[PDB]
């Protein structure tokens, strides 16, 4: 989720002044309407992978996601995407055109719990059509 | 007290600090003792390559020769600061501090305190300020005496240069200063009077120009060299 900047080089040209004003407005809308469509599917938690060539979630986008009560977590490794989809039963979403309710998972209490300086986001309860469930076990101790 | 604190240091106290300030004062006094007066000796300064610069001014001697002593750098700032605003009295400050320390040091050896000695200099200084009012003489500027300005100009010029340079350079200053006095009576030295370097026939050929001289001219050949009535822009 970031300002538009596609694969081919994109040189933006501003010819008149109304246009400076507009470019800003249009963006505060390219993030808003995409976040507005997340409310239509009532998806409550988002998990973004490690973003390359640009920031994963823009700071301007966090204001829209934080006011609508959506947890945001970024910088997830790429190989773990197979783990989360297999465990939670949630198919990944690469485009908003394919973003639907049927592809999302479910959970009773997605919670970050903190233990004396260790932040943990543990999901309680999984229910899905999956013949290959997952398991996770943390380790605690004195030193690494 | 300082050696156990600092592993390396130098400390002088209660006899060497007094001898240093007097010995450095007598040493720096002997340098500028011979320059004071009209028949004093000249002094050149050739630093690195051999740049040569000749003058009798104590400020040029102090602000060109690097000095390591802690006493003389205060005499350098004192001799420089007095001359930088007044323009005269450089070596006089060095001779007073050069002489007043040694003249008081004999009584410090006798056992008189430094505090009450300097208390005598301050109350004696106030007597000299009261004496300046009675010692000075009033002079009215409305007379516009050119002979009085000529004699003042020869006081400083005879000290630096000989009589051959003083006689030809004295009226150069008097003609420049004669135009300073006006109805407003506001003095202006830096903007009005200037100095410019020019390698030419000899020092004796210094002449006075009533207008502003410039160090540049016409680049093109066809442009006019001499102009009778030129209205500037």
């Amino acid at each position: 989720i970031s300002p538009p900047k596609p694969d081919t080089e994109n040189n933006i040209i501003v010819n008149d002044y109304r246009q400076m004003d507009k470019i800003l407005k249009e963006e505060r809308a390219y993030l808003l309407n995409i976040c507005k469509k997340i409310k239509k599917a009532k998806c409550n938690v988002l998990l973004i992978q490690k973003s390359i060539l640009r920031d994963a979630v823009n700071d301007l986008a966090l204001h829209f996601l934080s006011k609508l009560n959506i947890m945001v977590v970024k910088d997830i490794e790429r190989e773990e995407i197979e783990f989360l989809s297999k465990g939670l039963g949630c198919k990944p979403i690469a485009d908003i055109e394919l973003f639907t309710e049927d592809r999302l998972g479910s959970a009773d209490l997605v919670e970050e719990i903190d233990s004396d300086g260790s932040k943990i986001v543990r999901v309680t309860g999984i229910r899905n059509n999956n013949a290959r469930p997952t398991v996770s076990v943390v380790i605690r101790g004195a030193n690494n | 007290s300082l050696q156990l604190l600092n592993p390396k240091a130098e400390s002088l106290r209660r006899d060497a600090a007094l001898k240093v300030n007097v010995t450095s004062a007598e040493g720096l006094q002997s340098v500028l003792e011979t320059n004071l007066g009209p028949k004093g000796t000249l002094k050149m300064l050739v630093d690195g390559a051999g740049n040569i610069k000749l003058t009798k001014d104590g400020k040029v001697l102090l602000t060109e020769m690097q000095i390591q002593s802690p006493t003389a750098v205060l005499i350098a700032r004192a001799a420089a600061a007095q001359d930088e605003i007044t323009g005269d009295g450089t070596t006089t400050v060095v001779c007073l501090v050069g002489e007043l320390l040694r003249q008081a040091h004999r009584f410090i050896q006798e056992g008189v305190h430094p505090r009450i000695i300097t208390d005598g200099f301050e109350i004696a200084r106030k007597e000299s300020m009261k004496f300046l009012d009675e010692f000075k003489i009033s002079k009215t500027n409305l007379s516009n005496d050119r002979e009085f300005l000529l004699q003042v100009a020869r006081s400083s010029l005879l000290t630096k240069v000989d009589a051959d340079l003083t006689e030809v350079l004295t009226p150069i200053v008097t003609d420049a200063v004669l135009s300073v006095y006006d109805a407003q009576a506001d003095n202006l030295d830096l903007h009005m009077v200037e100095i410019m370097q020019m390698q030419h026939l000899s020092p004796k050929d210094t002449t006075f120009i009533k207008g502003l001289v410039l160090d540049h001219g016409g680049r093109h050949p066809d442009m006019p060299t001499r102009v009778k009535n030129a209205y500037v822009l």
């Binding site: - | 007290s1 156990l4 802690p70």
Partner: protein, 520 residues
């Protein structure tokens, strides 16, 4: 081998012995720098300058000691200077003695370093009580007593001979900065220096003093009623923030691009002339063209003025810090300016701004110093900070404690009398507090050349019977009461001296071992 340590671990009793000897060594450097007959100190910094002074704080700034216990003693002068501004040498010389007197016991009678701390807080609690009782109040509006109060600290400096002028100089400056509780601050006190001249003609003048002249020659050098307007912005066309790149297709565009550069500076100058100011002070630089039409209205242009010198101008002239020029009005324009004049001095030009003198914001001022040389200016400037620091305490606290060691000697007598009735294990460190408080008059007698044996014996005999204001005359070296002597100091300096000295001992006494060379 093992970790970066264990070179030579100074452990046990010898570690504390070096700290008491190191803490005593700091006070011995400036032992002679106390009292009215105090000697000066010239320290040589490695950069190339020189510091000529007798203040213990300014001496200990330049010194460098490679020992960790002595550095904690070094930082106590910053506690005193950045709290009041007077009595820094008093703080360093008292603590040395407190650590020294407590030492006998630590070394021999084996009292553990915590029992001494408990004894000192009760001594600290009793010290504030007797210092509160010995001090007498004084009227703040009495200018006759205020001049004698300000010159108490000046008497221990070089400018006691000019004390008649310095008290008038400091009193006028403090009342200018004083805001109608009664909070003042020295950041607006301008410390601008002028080498040369006589101290008698040196005087404070209401307003500011710049180091620069006007730009154009036709500017008016003498204005009756200046109207100052502060500007932050460049008055010249500037490149601008985004990637710009104008692409020119027609021949009539480049001359248009250079023509709008002339019209934009006309537009910002013409709106400045809506109020018609006489003096325009810009923070950043100025262009040769905008200045030209600032001239076509009657303004005066100056060079770039740093921010600091504009915040003082804002309080003097009453103007506000203005950057956007389009929002310039008539209300925010400075007014009630006394006089404008430029003097000729060979160092640099100097523009004077005088005030009409006739609640609101606190007014600033600049104090003129006309010394003998550069070091004399820095010497006199620190005297004003030490003299003006005294004027703040009487306004914040109307109490006034006696000077000449009478306050600390009063602490010595009451702690000595009460030590007998304090029977127990705390009696030995509690009685040793009086042994150090009677040293700060002992240092005055040593500098005066008298015998402190019979003087202190005569002092304690007359202190209980005669009065609580008895003290030693530093000049003559005889017992003279402070009431007839007519010299008094604030009580706030006595509090910081007793608090900082005792609190420093509580930190250093807990030191067990010293291990050097661990890591960065």
């Amino acid at each position: 081998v093992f970790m970066n340590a264990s070179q030579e671990r100074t452990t046990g009793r010898q570690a504390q012995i070096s700290n008491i000897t190191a803490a005593k060594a700091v006070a011995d450097v400036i032992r002679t720098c106390l009292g009215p007959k105090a000697m000066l100190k010239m320290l040589l910094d490695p950069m190339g300058g020189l510091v000529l002074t007798n203040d213990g704080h300014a001496i200990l700034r330049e010194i460098d000691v490679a020992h960790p216990a002595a550095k904690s003693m070094l930082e106590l002068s910053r506690t005193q200077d950045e709290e009041v501004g007077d009595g820094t040498t008093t703080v360093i010389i008292l603590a040395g003695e407190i650590l020294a007197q407590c030492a006998p016991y630590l070394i021999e009678k084996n009292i553990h370093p915590v029992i001494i701390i408990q004894a000192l807080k009760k001594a600290l609690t009793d010290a504030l009580e007797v210092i509160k009782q010995v001090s007498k109040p004084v009227d703040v509006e009495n200018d006759a007593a205020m001049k004698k109060l300000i010159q108490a600290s000046i008497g221990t400096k070089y400018v006691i001979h000019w004390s008649e002028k310095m008290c008038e100089l400091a009193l006028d400056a403090v009342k200018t900065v004083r805001k109608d509780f009664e909070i003042d601050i020295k950041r607006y006190v301008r410390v601008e220096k002028i080498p040369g001249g006589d101290v008698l003609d040196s005087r404070v003048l209401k307003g500011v003093l710049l180091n620069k002249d006007v730009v154009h020659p036709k500017m008016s050098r003498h204005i009756e009623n200046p109207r100052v307007v502060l500007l932050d912005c460049p008055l010249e066309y500037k490149k601008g923030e985004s990637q710009t790149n104008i692409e020119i297709e027609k021949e009539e565009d480049w001359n248009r691009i250079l023509q709008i550069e002339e019209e934009q500076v006309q537009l910002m100058c013409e709106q400045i002339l809506a109020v018609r100011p006489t003096l325009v002070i810009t923070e950043k630089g100025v262009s040769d063209l905008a200045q030209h039409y600032l001239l076509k209205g009657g303004c005066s242009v100056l060079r770039r003025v740093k921010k600091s010198d504009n915040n003082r101008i804002a309080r003097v002239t009453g103007a506000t810090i203005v950057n956007r020029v389009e929002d310039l009005k008539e209300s925010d324009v400075g007014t009630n300016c006394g006089l404008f004049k430029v003097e000729m001095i060979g160092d640099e030009y100097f523009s004077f701004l005088d005030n009409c003198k006739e609640s609101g914001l606190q007014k600033a001022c600049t104090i003129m110093l006309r010394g003998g040389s550069k070091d004399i200016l820095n010497e006199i400037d620190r005297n004003l900070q030490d003299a003006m620091a005294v004027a703040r305490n009487v306004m914040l606290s109307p109490s006034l404690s006696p000077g000449g060691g009478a306050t600390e000697m009063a602490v010595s007598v009451k702690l000595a009398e009460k030590a007998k009735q304090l029977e127990g294990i705390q009696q030995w460190p509690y009685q040793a507090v009086a042994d150090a408080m009677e040293c700060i008059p002992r240092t005055l007698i040593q500098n005066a050349g008298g015998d402190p044996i019979r003087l202190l014996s005569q002092l304690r005999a007359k202190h209980a019977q005669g009065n609580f204001t008895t003290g030693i005359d530093g000049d003559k070296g005889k017992i003279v009461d402070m009431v007839s002597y007519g010299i008094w100091e604030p009580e706030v300096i006595k509090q910081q001296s007793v608090k900082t000295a005792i609190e420093s001992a509580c930190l250093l006494l807990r030191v067990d071992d010293i291990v050097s060379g661990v890591r960065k």
